[PDB]
Structures are given as structure tokens and as C-alpha cells.
Amino acid sequence: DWPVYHRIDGPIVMIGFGSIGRGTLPLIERHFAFDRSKLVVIDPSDEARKLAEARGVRFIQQAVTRDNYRELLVPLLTAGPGQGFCVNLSVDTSSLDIMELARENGALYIDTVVEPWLGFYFDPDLKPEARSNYALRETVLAARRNKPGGTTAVSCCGANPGMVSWFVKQALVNLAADLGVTGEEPTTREEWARLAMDLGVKGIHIAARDTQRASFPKPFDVFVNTWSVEGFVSEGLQPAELGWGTFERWMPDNARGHDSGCGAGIYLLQPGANTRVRSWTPTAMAQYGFLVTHNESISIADFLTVRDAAGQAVYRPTCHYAYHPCNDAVLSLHEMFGSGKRQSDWRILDETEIVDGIDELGVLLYGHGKNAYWYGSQLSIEETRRIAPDQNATGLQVSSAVLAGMVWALENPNAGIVEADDLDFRRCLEVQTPYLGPVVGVYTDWTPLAGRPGLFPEDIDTSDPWQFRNVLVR
Amino acid sequence: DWPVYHRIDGPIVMIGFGSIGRGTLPLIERHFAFDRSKLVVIDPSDEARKLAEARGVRFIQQAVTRDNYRELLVPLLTAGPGQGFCVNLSVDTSSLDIMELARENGALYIDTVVEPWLGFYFDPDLKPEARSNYALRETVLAARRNKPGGTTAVSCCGANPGMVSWFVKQALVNLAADLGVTGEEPTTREEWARLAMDLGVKGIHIAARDTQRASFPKPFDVFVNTWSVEGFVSEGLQPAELGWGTFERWMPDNARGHDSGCGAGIYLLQPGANTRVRSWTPTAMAQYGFLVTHNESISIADFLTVRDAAGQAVYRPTCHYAYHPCNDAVLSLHEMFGSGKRQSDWRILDETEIVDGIDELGVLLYGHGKNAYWYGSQLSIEETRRIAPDQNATGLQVSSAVLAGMVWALENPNAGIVEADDLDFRRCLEVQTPYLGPVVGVYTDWTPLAGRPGLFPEDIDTSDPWQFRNVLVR
Ligand SMILES: NC(=O)c1ccc[n+]([C@@H]2O[C@H](COP(=O)([O-])OP(=O)(O)OC[C@H]3O[C@@H](n4cnc5c(N)ncnc54)[C@H](O)[C@@H]3O)[C@@H](O)[C@H]2O)c1
Ligand SMILES: NC(=O)c1ccc[n+]([C@@H]2O[C@H](COP(=O)([O-])OP(=O)(O)OC[C@H]3O[C@@H](n4cnc5c(N)ncnc54)[C@H](O)[C@@H]3O)[C@@H](O)[C@H]2O)c1
Ligand SMILES: N=C(N)NCCCCN
Ligand SMILES: N=C(N)NCCCCN
């Protein structure tokens, strides 16, 4: 009695079958009507092939590359009888090139990252600015300007980026009620941005604490994570990056901006997974997060930008990731950065290996009259196993967001290139919420200046606790 | 058939019965002749009392304080018939005051730290320099200038500080031998300092990797360590501190020297357990260490100082701790600094709780013709259980160093106030080595500039890989 939202008439082309593909396929089978034979999975690994064969789904063992993607994908996307859906959950592939190929062939598209073709993340000829997620996102915004409207393609619709955009909207609604701000619920981007401004939201952390842990301890010289190791390391070695709020009075000496684009970002000349920030979640209370670049750090700040008539930004929230991954991933980062090179091996924790834990993932809106408000999911591994197969709690928050994005795309298939900020947050959360466990809002009086200054002189701004100057760990 | 080294002809007063007192008591019983009733343990803890009652030893459940130490310890240490031994393995007590009391009453003395009376480490009216181990050590040096000679008192004779001073001497001898330099090894402090100078030793890391882990995972809001939690947190919140070599050409903007004293130190205006350095051990290979202040960072640099006729330092090595504690302690530090406060609870891992692991503890001499040489112990928990009770591998390296210092003090009882750098390193290692497991010397071509620069600008000195500029994580 799981809801079947729609029938999909055309081919369903899943690119990538790692941790998220494995968790998303069963949700697609559960929630859409289609002949199983219309699915096709593309992945270069033998591991993926054997799992796909165990599920009786068509499999092509190929890496999608710049050289082959047109000849490989166009026949799959256009096999008919109707509109196909490209579900892209891969690494090492260009999200922009594949999305544009889907659109010109009339196929819907969804992904969870603006990924580049293999070679980009470690290309020594690129300036740091060009390796930023701001720069990658700007290629998507340029593609939209060049071809407005047309077939829907949903960029960056996982848990974060993705779901957390919908949490920001729900949190703004809750804050407005709790603070007594009158007005109808916003229905346009400008109205959302004005509501954040009117509420006095100085900034937003994507504030996450993963407490899953395995039945075995972290092995030496093995990177351990609850989702893509390759993907986490790639974003962790990109510059630290944030949407930059109009309220900020200070940035570090090694911070840089952008000469062009939407104007909402800065980045630091240091890797994000070795950059710490002071943050807070309900279960962690005060904790360090890593300032890992994410698409939504830019997209949320951009979405909530208010401009004057000259086009100058007069309000924008700071927005960035404050990630505390699982303990073995924390150790894995200490080992990787401490050695100066990637470990020899890695592994992604399977639900059969996880003893207990939750993936606490939400948004921390701060600077308003009630100081700080966290809104999000506290999904446990135990609940995950009861309600969805083949994934851990991290995976289910992502796969269920892809499901919601797919439902929205089928119901709005002529919307052009869109981000999660552009979707109907209420419909998406209606689809996703059965998979999120406890979803709660919590206020706190904690601030980044709690307990400070201490035994040593610190470079703090005592006038405003939430300044990045107080959040960033030097 | 354990060797019995000496008769102790007077009371043995053990102050403190935590992890190190528990590991040292069986070695004292094993290796010294004395009537059982001569030994008494002083500790305020109920847990300690119960264990001592179980070991059949006299126990006085009392905190030693500035107000009571004279009335308590003078009668106990002078009970007769001859010279007693104060074995000080406590926290929250003044090493200097207890040492001076023991000496004025003719009792031998040993400790593993220059500890202050309770209140000092977190005193808000103290400048950071006054909280430094350099400053604490200078109180011992002044005591020795005021009362030269007299009864032997051994300051800071644990594993590190303590044993590592003997490892430095052995490593210097080994480096010379490996180069083909033959001849009488040094006998005076000047000759040792000139050996380091002549061999081109630029600096020394106390380079350690603890791999012990427990049968339960790290509990939330519990600090876990393999030795004193209180003591590790105390030194971890003291300023980062190092003996400062003559070859260094850069120091950070928040580094400071000292107006007075032996001249060998700098400190940083930040806590050492939240300061990382690039270092290396044989089992870890390249790793982060924490730059936690330690007595030997200053005492080894001081000992190996060569001065000119005017008294100015012409050569001195850099010397500092590069500590990678057990994984649960790494997580404990991330938790403590990330929350801004000490955890609600703590625990020290017992040998019965430890599944496997070693305490790899040695000295990394660098800058000489063979680049870098690590010399030290790789004692495993499995070997520990075979050879000594009531402790883990970390404890046994410490307790066996205390044993060695006790033998040396009984053999050289008229030497006055001394540090581990002043003892006969061969005799001390002769006593200690049965408890050290594999003791090895390993060369490596690794330097702090391995793999650097990466994809971000870095301030590095490529002319001199081992400069602190390149070691310090910035
Ligand atoms: N919330 C979010 O937005 C979010 C969360 C998790 C993951 N992600 C992203 O989702 C993607 C997948 O994550 P995951 O955990 O499943 O990763 P994963 O590492 O588990 O799996 C990635 C898969 O991609 C395949 N692959 C590699 N090269 C390929 C190519 N050229 N063509 C096709 N497939 C290729 C691999 O063989 C592998 O099976 C990653 O890009 C990741 O960063 C997003
Ligand atoms: N290699 C080294 O040099 C080295 C290594 C380990 C420990 N240390 C030092 O040795 C000492 C003991 O370490 P540990 O692991 O045994 O610590 P621990 O925390 O296990 O035990 C400390 C004990 O001191 C006792 N104590 C507290 N206040 C006291 C007082 N006023 N009088 C007497 N006893 C008191 C406590 O009850 C506790 O039992 C610490 O100072 C530590 O820093 C040195
Ligand atoms: N989300 C933004 N930053 N802008 C609005 C984009 C709307 C695309 N239809
Ligand atoms: N170890 C030194 N730094 N100096 C020599 C001290 C000698 C004490 N008898």
C-alpha cells in the first residue's frame, strides 16, 4: 500500500549504481508503474554488475565518458515509447553535458551534484576559483539562460544539496509564525527572499551529525564513510566555500570572491574537509563541522537574495555546510590529511555492518529574534531498515529526495533546468517525509561565542556572535 | 627470575594510584627488596582505595594539598630506619614543593611531570607564558641553583618526558656509528651537544602513535584515553610549546619567547592539543601529531645546546612533541574542542578492555645526512599482558621508566636535582628494556614537504624541508 505516484512510459536510464543508485532503484520500483525491462543501469564496476544482475535489471558495464556519452546515451534515452527519465547517480561524469543531452532528446533528468568529467577535480592547470562549486554551478545557470524552459532537468536534488532547500522554506514558515511575522506564505523567489530578510536571518548552516558506526573499528589505511568515499574526498579537496551574507563584516586573508556570476559566494584557498567551523545540531549540541563545499551553499544564498533596482544585492544570508560525518570518517580525514595522500583502500558502510546511529541532517537558521533554529531529519538506521532496503540512513535521505524530485519532474515536465530551491517544497516533502524519520524544529541559545574568549587571545567579533569571524576555526 | 636491583632501607610513599601508580606498584614489588609494610599509597579516590585494598597494600585516602603536605609527608618519609623513596605519580600536587620537602628530609624522589598545586592550569589571572612548561621547569632549575647537590631527586622520568631522553642519546650514537664515525662516545653534556651539532641534527620530534582500541566504541560525551584524562587535558590546554632550534628561520605571528631562563623555548598563543604538526613514525608513516607541551621539548633542546665563549647559543636543536594518541582520544579531542568544554565523563582504557594495538613511542632526529631516523619502542598490548600486570602498553612504558629512574637514584643517591637527560642512559635503558617490546631504529626519506605544494598556495621553505614553517599545520 505504498503510493504509486505515476506510470513512467519511457526508458529509465540510471547512470551509476553505487550506494545511492542501490538505494534509489527500489524506491523507483516501489513508487512508479513501469515494465521492469525498461530500466537500464550503466556502471563500469563488476560489483555494480553483479548487484544489478541479482535484481534482474538490464546492465551495461561501461564508464560514461566525454568521448562516448553521446553515442552511448542517445539510443537509451530515446528508446520510447514515451518520455524517458535519466537518473544520474554517478561520479566522474559531466552533469551539465548529460543533462543537456537529455533535454535535447526530450528526456527528464535528475542528479545530486554538479559533477565534472573525470580529470577536473585534480587538474593542476586550473585556478582554485575554477575548481569551485560556484564555478560549476555557473555552467548550469549559463545553460539555463541559453535554453530557457523546455524539458525539466533537476540539478542537485539529493539530501544536501536537495532536501535541505525544502527544509529552509519550512523553517522560514515556522520562524514567521513563532516570531509573529504576518503575510501570506511566499509563492515566488522574491517573496521567499523578502521573508528571510524580514525575519532577520543572518545566515544558515547545513548542520549535520552522522552517528552511524560499524561492527568493526576503522581499519588503518582505509577511508570509511556512509556514502561515496570518492565523492566525499573530491568535494573535501575542493576549496572551502560558502554563500556569503550581507551581514558579514570580515573574511579571512585567504578568502576570494568571483568577478562574474550570481555574486553570492566566496571561497577559501584551503581544502574544505580540513577547514573547521563552530556549529550545532540537536543531538550533537555544540560541535565542529567541516566547511566542505556544496551546491546549496551557493544556491540557497542566491535564491534568498534581495536586490535593489540597480541590481545590487541588499540582503543575502550566509549559507554553508557544517558537516560532522561519522566518527570513522572523522578519523579517515585526520589520516588522509595527516599522510598527505589518499588511503590505499576505502569502504562504504553497509546497513548490515552498522550497529546503530542516526543521520541528523537539517538547517540551522540564525541571527533572528530567537537566536537559532534547527529544522531537519533525525532518521535512524533502525527505522531505515524497516522502511527501505539496500541502504543506510545517509543513503535513504538521498534516495528519497531523488524520488521526490522525480515525482515533481513528472508532474512538472516542462519547467526547464531547475534546482531544488525552484521546486514546490510542500509536494517534495509530502513524497519524501515517509522516509525521513523524526523531522523536528528545535531552538537553541547556543552561539559561536559560547565560552569565549577563553585562556588564549582570540580574534573574535563580540558585537555579533554569528559572524563568520567567530564561526571559522583558525 | 626477575632481577632484584636494590634494597630500599626506608619507607616507600607512593603519591597517586591512577593508571601509572597501578602499573608502577607491581614493578616496585618485583624489583626491590623491602618489608611489605614499608610501602604506603596516598590517593583521595575511592576507586583507588578499593584496588589497593585488593592488592594488600597500605592506603591513605587523602588529597595532598598545600595546606597538609608537610604534616602528612614528613612523618611518612622519615619513618626509618634509613632512606625512603617518594614516588610521586599524582595530579593536582606541586612536584617542586614535594621534591624540596623530600630532599630536606633525606628521602629520594621521582616524578613524571612538573605538576603545580591544584588551581594553576585554569587560573584566569595567569598569562599564557606563566602556564607554560618552560616556566614550570624553570622553578626546578632555580631550586637546583639554590641548593646544588644533596639527595637525588629525579624530575620528569616517565616515558615522555623521561625515557625519550635516553632514546635521543642512543639515537645520536647510532647515527654516528651508521656514518662510520668511531671513537669514545660522549661523556659530558658538552660532548653530547657537540655530537648533535657535528652530526647536523636540526631537530627532534617526540614522535608517537598509540593504536590501542577498546572492545566498545567511543561513547558520546565521554573522553577516552589510555592514560590520565585529566592530565592529558591539562597539558593539551596549556600553550603549544617547543624547544627552538638555531636552524629555524620562521615562527608564527602568535609565537613568543621568554625573557628569562635557559633560553631554549618558544610557545604559541593557542592550545597544544588543538595544534597539529606533520610528523612520522614507522607504523604510522606520515601522520599528524598534536603539538602538546612537554618538559622534554625544553629539556632536550637545553641539554643539546652548544654555547660560545660569551654564553650565546651557537647550536640548539628544535625539539617538540608530535603526538598521535589512540583513535578514541583523537575523537575525544575533536569532541572537546568542538563543544568548547570538557566532556561530562571520562575513562581510561584498562588492559581488559583493549582488543589490540601498540604504543609506538620514539624520537625522530632529522636534518642530518640520512634525513630522518626514528628510534624507540613498539610495545604491544599483548606483550604487555605477558610481562607486567595492571596496565596497558602506554602505562608500562611509563612505569618501567619510573623503575629505571628509581634504580638510578638508589645507585646515585647524592646527585641532587636531575632530569632524565642527566642520568646514565645506558644503565637506565638496561633496566627498562625488558618492558619495552621491540626497540628499533628506522631511517626514512620522508620529509614534511612530501607531496607539497598541492593544489593550494602554501607558505613553504623548499630550501629546508624540516623548517617548522613546513611542519606546522597552518
Ligand atoms: N545529498 C546529496 O546531494 C548527495 C549525497 C550522496 C551522494 N551524492 C552524489 O551522488 C553520487 C553517487 O554517490 P554514491 O554514494 O552512490 O557514490 P559511490 O561511490 O558509491 O558510487 C559511484 C558509482 O559511480 C560509478 N562510476 C564511476 N565512473 C563512472 C562513469 N564514468 N560512468 C558511470 N558510472 C561511474 C562507480 O563505478 C560507482 O558504482 C556522487 O556524485 C555523490 O557525490 C550526493
Ligand atoms: N611519560 C610521562 O612522563 C607521563 C605519562 C603518563 C602520565 N604522566 C603523569 O603522571 C601522572 C599520573 O598519570 P595517571 O595516568 O596515573 O593519571 P590518573 O589520572 O590516572 O591518576 C591520577 C591520580 O592522582 C590522584 N590525585 C588527585 N589529586 C590528588 C592529590 N591531591 N593527592 C594525591 N593524589 C591525587 C587521583 O585520585 C588519581 O588517582 C599525571 O600527572 C600524568 O600527567 C606522565
Ligand atoms: N533559484 C534561483 N536562484 N533562481 C530562480 C530560477 C528559476 C528557474 N525557473
Ligand atoms: N641537563 C642540563 N640541562 N644541564 C645539566 C644539569 C646537571 C645537573 N647536575
Numbering used by the authors:
A (entry chain A), B (entry chain B): 3 to 476
Provide text from the study:
Bacterial HSS is mostly found in α-proteobacteria and in some β- and γ-proteobacteria, including pathogenic strains such as Legionella pneumophila, Brucella spp. and various P. aeruginosa strains, including PA7 and PA14. It catalyzes the conversion of two molecules of putrescine (PUT; 1,4-diaminobutane) into one molecule of sym-homospermidine [HSP; bis(4-aminobutyl)amine] as the main reaction along with several side reactions. Bacterial HSS is NAD+-dependent, active at neutral to basic pH with an optimum at pH ∼8.8, and shows increased activity in the presence of 50 mM potassium ion. BvHSS forms a dimer, with each subunit containing a boot-shaped substrate-binding pocket between an NAD(P)-binding Rossmann-like domain and an HSS-like domain.
Krossa and coworkers identified three binding sites for the amino groups of reaction components within the substrate-binding pocket. Assuming the amino groups of the reaction components to be protonated at neutral to slightly basic pH, the ‘innermost’ N atoms of PUT (N1) and of HSP (N01) mainly bind via a salt bridge to Glu210 and, in addition, via a hydrogen bond to Asn162 at the ‘inner amino site’. Following a similar approach to probe the role of BvHSS residue Glu210, the E210A, E210Q and E210K variants were examined and were found to be inactive. These findings convincingly demonstrate the indispensable need for a negative charge at position 210 to stabilize the positively charged amino groups of the reaction component at the ‘inner amino site’.
